[PDB]
């Protein structure tokens, strides 16, 4: 999945213009993603790891 360009994007829009993008046709290993402590906040509602 194109997470590299999402995390390394130069410019982001304002709060009133939050971007919505469909994530599909790609496979990523979220396990390593949530195994790290890089993200200050990681909260899941309605699902379990």
């Amino acid at each position: 999945c194109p997470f590299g360009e999402v995390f390394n994007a130069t410019r982001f829009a304002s709060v009133y213009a939050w971007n919505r993008k469909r994530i599909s046709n790609c496979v990523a290993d979220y396990s390593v993603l949530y195994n790290s402590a890089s993200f200050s906040t990681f909260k899941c509602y309605g699902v379990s790891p």
Partner: antibody
Amino acid sequence: SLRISCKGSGYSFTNYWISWVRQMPGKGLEWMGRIDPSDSYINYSPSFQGHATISADKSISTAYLQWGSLKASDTAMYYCARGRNY
Amino acid sequence: DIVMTQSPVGDRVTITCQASQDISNYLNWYQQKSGKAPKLLIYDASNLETGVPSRFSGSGSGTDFTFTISSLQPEDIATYYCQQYDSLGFTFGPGTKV
């Protein structure tokens, strides 16, 4: 549900580190996690399984602990005290 | 995933630390007392945080590291944990309990 709270007073909570200790009877020291208020740095135990996570509220100086799925080993007493200065 | 395996009063006891890949000198050490919690003392193996005694030192490079006590003391009983960090994340080992 059961909630356990341990709130200090008379001193700056953000200026004094707070750590949690888990020790059920018949076992040794099993650390789980510590938080750095400056950057929310979380260090995990060597035998971590993603059971419980620590969170704090700077607005009200209150720390909350929740369990994703309570099990038998969660029934234990916890040690809380003011830590070393800085 | 990545799987890691480790083998195996006053006697010579030596422990080793292993990592999935080469970590150069990016190592961490812990100090544990009877009633106390583990605390970060040295980070990057080149900066001594204020208040930490200077008697603690390390040597070696690459994939082999050794821990040696110059003089064992009754107050020196502790369990040491080894932590490594890389550009991807943080991986922990089972460790050894005394």
